[PDB]
Symmetry: C3
Subunit: 89 residues, 3 copies
Amino acid sequence: MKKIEAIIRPFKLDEVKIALVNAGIVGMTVSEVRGFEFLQKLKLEIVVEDAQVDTVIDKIVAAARTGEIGDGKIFVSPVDQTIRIRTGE
Amino acid sequence: MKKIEAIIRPFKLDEVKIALVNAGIVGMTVSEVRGFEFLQKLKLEIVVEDAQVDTVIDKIVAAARTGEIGDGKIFVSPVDQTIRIRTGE
Amino acid sequence: MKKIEAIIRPFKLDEVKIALVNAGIVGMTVSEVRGFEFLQKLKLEIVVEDAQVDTVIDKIVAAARTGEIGDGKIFVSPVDQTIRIRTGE
Ligand SMILES: [Cl-]
Ligand SMILES: [Cl-]
Ligand SMILES: [Cl-]
């Protein structure tokens, strides 16, 4: 299993919020960070099985392209254990 | 050593802020993230020795239960080095 | 390659924003988190080659010193793959 983190610099921002939502990357979470002129950036994170890493990287890149794409970086790192809990509404 | 990250979806939110504080998980940090209807979620992170991982996972789950528990996910990942600095006030 | 995460507690805050900027740590991103009295903290993240880890740790510590330094923690963890994309403005 791997964690995928992407830090991307929106140009067409709102267009990229839409990109991210339309991308259909289930379980992805997003937060704002700043890089350096302080630059607002989006940070995306998701944990997937090893066999899914390239697929998710591709969806992130394709989403970024529909917006900016500008500058961005993606990191893949190991995950030892995951526990996922779902409760019906 | 391991990093533990939990992303949890508050139902009884304020009740879960209280849960997290009462839990006594020393050094835990918390931030807000969003998942997808944008859903506000809490992200908790802590780094512990390997022998402490299950204990901390259990405290996080028990805290979540006092609030929602709803949906949540916990990831355990490796840490190579830690440096911790304390200065007296 | 390694990810370096630092969570630091500003005393002379603004002085430490300046410290972080002056530090010249290219590509570092920063976000706010909270630890526990809720305490606002800064989280810094950067991914570097293994040979650069000590250099970056030293710059973070030196920056923290110009401000507080107070309390802080630094974690080094493995990274399997990085993809970095730059587009000219
Ligand atoms: Cl996930
Ligand atoms: Cl910690
Ligand atoms: Cl980086």
